[PDB]
């Protein structure tokens with residue numbers, strides 16, 4: 219039996235929230251079998267819990283923001299979610315004392331190190347996967363995102379930026395997903411901002427925790443970061459990282475093929491919700507026989 223995974227020990231990471239610019243303490247706790255992925259706001263009395271549910275994504279303006287019925291929020295969940303998806307963590311209590319996950323370096327890599335430092339633990343319960351059984355597409359003008367049946371997990375993402383710095387790079391990236399391929403190729407890709415946008419958001423009280431230490435900052439012509447890019451096509455690698463993170467909002471790994479053109483938080487959630495609402499387009503699968511598991515889900 220392919221077992222569910224949790225953490226061996228409680229870990230912590232303190233940083234700043236990208237938008238509030240206020241100190242956030244992220245506490246990752248082991249959870250038993252069948253609890254699922256839980257986001258907790260500890261700064262509240264009583265604390266507020268958010269089960270990983272596609273429908274909780276209510277604001278996709280700046281990031282993937284989870285909002286409950288009383289306007290309690292958890293934002294910037296995508297980078298941490300990518301790490302969780304990449305390592306196949308099923309049961310975990312994600313605790314924050316601020317309305318957002320700390321930005322760290324702007325990628326999923328700090329969260330991967332954090333999961334590794336804690337150690338992955340297997341539980342005596344079968345790991346549930348969402349298997350795509352029909353093609354499901356979503357559109358938003360020229361942009362679209364799709365899921366097709368596939369025995370493993372792949373991502374093919376296309377960006378189209380009419381920017382001197384981004385177009386210079388490769389704008390289409392495709393990979394067969396695995397814990398290894400994610401860590402090596404995707405996890406370290408950082409988020410990116412245009413100085414025009416940052417200045418606008420900052421005067422309105424948003425992006426207060428933004429710096430070069432947490433993002434690729436671009437002007438109207440070039441990358442402003444001293445040390446440059448970590449990858450030639452870091453832009454497209456990050457867009458794929460966000461998609462991995464966003465799709466993980468159902469809190470289970472997906473067995474299927476993802477394709478996108480100009481997708482983002484909004485569209486990634488749209489497809490996720492569209493697939494999940496179409497009863498016949500997916501099913502929960504377990505692997506009582508380890509031999510049946512597709513190669514994509516091999517151990518890290």
Ligand SMILES: CCCCCCCCCCC[C@@H](O)CC(=O)O[C@@H]1[C@@H](N)[C@@H](OP(=O)(O)OP(=O)(O)OC[C@H]2O[C@@H](n3ccc(=O)[nH]c3=O)[C@H](O)[C@@H]2O)O[C@H](CO)[C@H]1O
Pocket residue numbers: 278279280281376377378379380409410411412415416425427428429430432433435460479480481482483484
């Ligand atoms: C002295 C100290 C000062 C220095 C401090 C600097 C601080 C650094 C902080 C940076 C913070 C950034 O993080 C904030 C921030 O806004 O970052 C966002 C991020 N949220 C994400 O937004 P989202 O994933 O939802 O993508 P949208 O598709 O909704 O993009 C929206 C528009 O882009 C078009 N589009 C989309 C896809 C594509 O393939 N092509 C293309 O053209 C599309 O037509 C639409 O009009 O990606 C965006 C890019 O795409 C980033 O700008």
Ligand SMILES: [Zn+2]
Pocket residue numbers: 296297408409456459460
């Ligand atoms: Zn991102």
